[PDB]
Amino acid sequence: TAFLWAQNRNGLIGKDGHLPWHLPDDLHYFRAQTVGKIMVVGRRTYESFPKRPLPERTNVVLTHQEDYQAQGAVVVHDVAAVFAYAKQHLDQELVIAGGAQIFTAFKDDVDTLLVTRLAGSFEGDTKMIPLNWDDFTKVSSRTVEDTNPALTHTYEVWQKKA
Ligand SMILES: NC(=O)C1=CN([C@@H]2O[C@H](COP(=O)(O)OP(=O)(O)OC[C@H]3O[C@@H](n4cnc5c(N)ncnc54)[C@H](OP(=O)(O)O)[C@@H]3O)[C@@H](O)[C@H]2O)C=CC1
Ligand SMILES: CN(Cc1cnc2nc(N)nc(N)c2n1)c1ccc(C(=O)N[C@@H](CCC(=O)O)C(=O)O)cc1
């Protein structure tokens, strides 16, 4: 199970229910990373997608609303249902795409971090959950420079030590 997120230099991930930046490169990397997999997102991050569901991947939406409707998405209500779905699934990798409340609900079962680090600093209200960095190794790092230098970013892959 992977977590996939983008954060500024201080860890910021969101502002007013939306992204605090607009960084197309990162969105085509998101898609690369989630097409074909089981993609888990919290109800509020799902309602912020411009097309719901996002196509070519299983969107699982985590909601406490018993009645919620999301045509074409897998609507569950606790973490045990996510993993009961993933157990049925097998051959699709599970990727937790946010936001903060869902990262906290899977904080013990993630093995890989797919982090995009922005060089700048943005204003918002939601930060990435604290994680033990010391328990992971950075395996891969690729940097993309943008003409807004706040937007220059690094894609890192981190994998959990034995
Ligand atoms: N920079 C980036 O990589 C990322 C950015 N973001 C940003 O993060 C913010 C969204 O984060 P946050 O506000 O934490 O929202 P979430 O996307 O994590 O959604 C929270 C909703 O999730 C449902 N929920 C939470 N935990 C549970 C549980 N254990 N079981 C079942 N339902 C659960 C509830 O929905 P209900 O209210 O329907 O009960 C709760 O309101 C936005 O600004 C967004 O843009 C989001 C993803 C990635
Ligand atoms: C708000 N949000 C959450 C979002 C944004 N960037 C992230 N970036 C990373 N690295 N990780 C995340 N979990 C992440 N989540 C969104 C908004 C749009 C789409 C979206 O349109 N994406 C298209 C691709 C489109 C583009 O390629 O212009 C997709 O097909 O995946 C994805 C996530």
- CA dihedral for 97, 100, 101, 107, sign (positive or negative): positive
Residue 108 domain boundaries: 1-162
What is the best residue among 8, 64, 121, 153 to mutate for testing ligand 1's pocket, by most ligand atoms within 8 Å of CB?
64
Active site annotation includes 152? no
What token pair was written down for 14?
A: 């969101």
Given the CA of residue 97, which atom of ligand 2 is nearest to it? 13
Residue of 106, 120, 102, 123 lying closest to 46 (CA atoms): 102
Atom of ligand 2 nearest to the CA of 5: 11
Distance from C-alpha of 61 to C-alpha of 4, rounded to nearest angstrom: 15
What does the block give as tokens for 56?
Answer: 């070519």
Experimental method, per PDB record: X-ray
Edge-to-edge, what's the strand order for the sheet holding 94-96?
Answer: 74-76, 58-62, 38-42, 94-96, 2-7, 112-118, 153-160, 136-144
Q: Could you check whether the bond before residue 20 is cis, i.e. omega within 30 degrees of 0?
A: no
Provide the token pair at 139: 């395996």
Ligand 2: which of 27, 29, 115 to mutate, judged by most atoms within 8 Å of the beta carbon? 27
Q: Identify the active-site residue in 23, 94, 113, 118.
A: 94
- Of 115, 118, 98, the C-alpha closest to 18 is 98
Contact call for residues 115 and 129 (beta carbons, < 8 A):
no
- For the record, the structure tokens of 120 come out as 């700048």
User: What CATH number is associated with residue 82?
Assistant: 3.40.430.10
What DSSP character marks residue 129?
P
To what resolution in angstroms was this structure determined?
A: 1.7
Q: How far apart are CA 26 and CA 11, in angstroms?
A: 16
Tally the domains of the chain.
1
Give yes or no for residue 50 CB within 6 A of ligand 2: yes
The token pair at 143 is 């940097």
Phi/psi for 122 (5° steps) reads -130, 160
> Closest ligand to 14 CA?
1
> How far does residue 25's CA lie from ligand 2's centre (Å)?
10
Cα 162 to middle of ligand 1, angstroms? 30
The residue type of 70 is A
Residue type, 90: L
CA dist list (Å): 39 to 49, 56, 142, 144, 150: 13, 10, 23, 25, 28
